[PDB]
Each structure stands twice: as structure tokens, then as C-alpha cells.
Amino acid sequence: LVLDQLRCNGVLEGIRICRQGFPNRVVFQEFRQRYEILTPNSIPKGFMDGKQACVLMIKALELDSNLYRIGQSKVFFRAGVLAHLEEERDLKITDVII
Amino acid sequence: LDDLLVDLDHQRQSACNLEKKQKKFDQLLAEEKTISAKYAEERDRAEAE
Amino acid sequence: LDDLLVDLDHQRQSACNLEKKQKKFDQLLAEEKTISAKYAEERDRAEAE
Amino acid sequence: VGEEAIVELVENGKKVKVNKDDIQKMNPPKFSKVEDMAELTCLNEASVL
Amino acid sequence: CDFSEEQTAEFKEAFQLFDRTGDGKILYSQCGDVMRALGQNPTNAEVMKVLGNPKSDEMNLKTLKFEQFLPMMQTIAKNKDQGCFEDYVEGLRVFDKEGNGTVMGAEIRHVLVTLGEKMTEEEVEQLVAGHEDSNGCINYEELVRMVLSG
Amino acid sequence: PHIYAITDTAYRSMMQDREDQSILCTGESGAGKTENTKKVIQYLAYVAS
């Protein structure tokens, strides 16, 4: 009965699209504002295209090229990548926030 | 094959993180040495006080 | 799939060959931090006195 | 034998003939009771169940 | 002492204004709050450090004399981890997702309650209270400058 | 994992994104939809009052 519910509910297909896909996706400017604190020297402090700024940030973060894809208006990430970036961001700010 | 690809991608991610931390090791030791030297100075100062 | 299994058995050993180093590095850091903590404790006791 | 395999059942020792596409891979005990099933290495009905 | 007695005379009174033993003594839990009342900004880590890392129950029971409180204040006055306004505004901007000089009050509450040395929700609501706008946004530059100059 | 974690994740997503959220309990009759709905309401009533 549990197997039949997992089958009709599409539970395994749902897990697979989370693992095989990119369920985390952030607009270039939001990615900058959230995570530029992780890599503050990575962008020359003048104006820059948000997409190119995100490319520079992701290179300075040295993320594996399979963990992300870059779109027309968003960066896409594998599951759990943004969780790690959030943990690292929280660590940097915890000194100032204390 | 899809499961093997996801697994191998995670192993690749873990090895990349280990390599990055292995590179980070040098400056971590330099920092630990400088901060321990500062603590040695501070203990000398506090004993002198 | 056979090629992926070969790549996986290669990658796991290649990662273990870094973890063997990380064991040593973690032990070194643990000792260096024990020394720095002892200096910080001596500093704190001297400041309290 | 191509289409079929023989297995011994852990609860019985009984030897049985099973079709190679009805066998499902098993996760290491490392993944016992994982909180998030996306983390399973082998993702199939038997592992989720 | 290496401290100006003219303000030591004020600190004697300001300490005594915390009176609840019935005499010239006050309990470890109060020590941080009297130091914060006299004008310093000790972290709770610093408060525990100068108190010699007391236990969480001992904090309720053990007590300072003013003669012991004065050097505590002196230690916190002379050496500090305190940052500055120009640093804190750069910290708050991490939450400024849009660049207008404003941040969401619910975000600042969540941050202060969850990160670092966690504040109570009652404290944090008193902090954000009065910085409302029609969007629920706080202007972090002025919030930081007001809290710091307060 | 808990219904409180799902509810808090939705509440934080609504405050962060400013996008409205849904909690959608989907099952057979007897599956627990109404009980979990009560727990979602209990959590929001406590945390967001």
C-alpha cells in the first residue's frame, strides 16, 4: 500500500528531478547582493554587467562547473549549494553581528 | 546510470573541496602561528602588569 | 555504465589519497590550537591576576 | 545467464531465480534512516520503502 | 588606578542604583547590565571572561563588590573588540538586497535573534519598534547610527 | 524533518521573497492531511503572532 502511494504520488520522480535538476535559481543582482560578501575583491568596484559579475563571483568561489548553470537572467544551482553558501555567508557576518 | 552520475558528481565535489582545503592549510598554519605568537606576547604583558 | 564504474572506483581512491593527508593536517592543527589555547589561558589568568 | 540471476534470501538462505530487471541495488548502511531521501546513493522503490 | 577618579565617583553612584541585595553589592548577572549602563559595550563573552567564566547558576548567586567591579570596568574600558559605525553599516548592507539604503525589519529581527550572541524576541522588538515604514523596511544607516549614538 | 520545519521554511520564504506561499497536504482519506493542517496553523499562530 505504501509502494502504491509512492508510485501514484510521483514521489521518486519528484526526488529525481531534485537530484538531476537545478532546483535553486537566483537572479544575477540578488546573487551579487547576497553573496558578494563572500568574495569582495572578485569584482572591480566600478559598474559591471550583473551576469558577468555573477560569473566572476562564481569563479572566485571556485564552484565546480557542474554544480551550476548560467541562464539569461538567473544562475541555477544544484540542491544544497545555496545552503552551503548561506552557511559561509552567516559565518562571515557573525563576527560583525556579534 | 543517472544515480551513478549523481554519486560521482558528489564524490568529485568532495575531492575538490578537500583539495581546496589542502591548499588553504598553509595560510591556516601561518595564521595559527601568528596568533599564538600574539598570545605569547599578551601573556608576557599581563604577567608584567 | 561500466566506464562510469571505472571512473567511480578511480575517484574514490583519489579522494582517499587526500583524506589520508587531511588526517595528518587535522592532527597538526589540533596540536597547534592546543598550544595557542594554552597561551590564551595563561594570558587570561595573568590578566585576571 | 543474461536475463536471470540466482539470489539467496537473507531471511531464509533460500536460493531463488529472479529476473535481472527486478533486482534493485541497495544503499550502504551508512544511509540508514537518512532525513532527506534525495541524499540516498541508490534511489529506487526498494530504497525509498 | 589608571583611571580618572572623577568618573569613578559617578560609577559608585550608578553601581549603587542597582540596589537589590539591600547593600553595596550586586550579583554577577547584573554585572554586564551595569557595565552597559555606565556607557561601555561589553559582549556577553567579555562579561563572562571578566567574571572568570562562572556557571550559569553561579551567575545568579555570586556577587561583586564595587572594589571588584571597578577593575572589571577598567579592563573593558582599556581594551575592547568593539567595531564602529563605518563597519556596522557595511555589515547591515549584506541584507540590503536592493541598494536603496533599506533592509526589511523582519530580516533584521531574524538575524539578531538567530546569529551571533542571540537576543530575545522581546529585546529585538523593542529595537525595531519605531523604525517602521509603509514597507516594513528599516534604513540601516540611520538605525545603526541611532543605536550606536544612543 | 517536521511539519514545523516546512511551515517555518514557508514563512521565511514569504518574508524573504515577499512571494505568497502554499502548504498542500495531499493524500488518501485517513492519511493525515487534516492533522498536519492543524499543526501548520498551530505553528503559524505561535511563531507569527
Ligand SMILES: Nc1ncnc2c1ncn2[C@@H]1O[C@H](COP(=O)(O)OP(=O)(O)O)[C@@H](O)[C@H]1O
Ligand atoms: N500526525 C499525526 N499524529 C497522530 N495521529 C494522527 C496523525 N495524523 C493522523 N492521525 C490519526 O489518523 C486519523 C486520520 O487523520 P486525518 O488527518 O484526520 O485524515 P485526513 O487526512 O483524511 O483528514 C486522525 O484522526 C488521527 O487519529
Ligand SMILES: [Mg+2]
Ligand atoms: Mg480531513
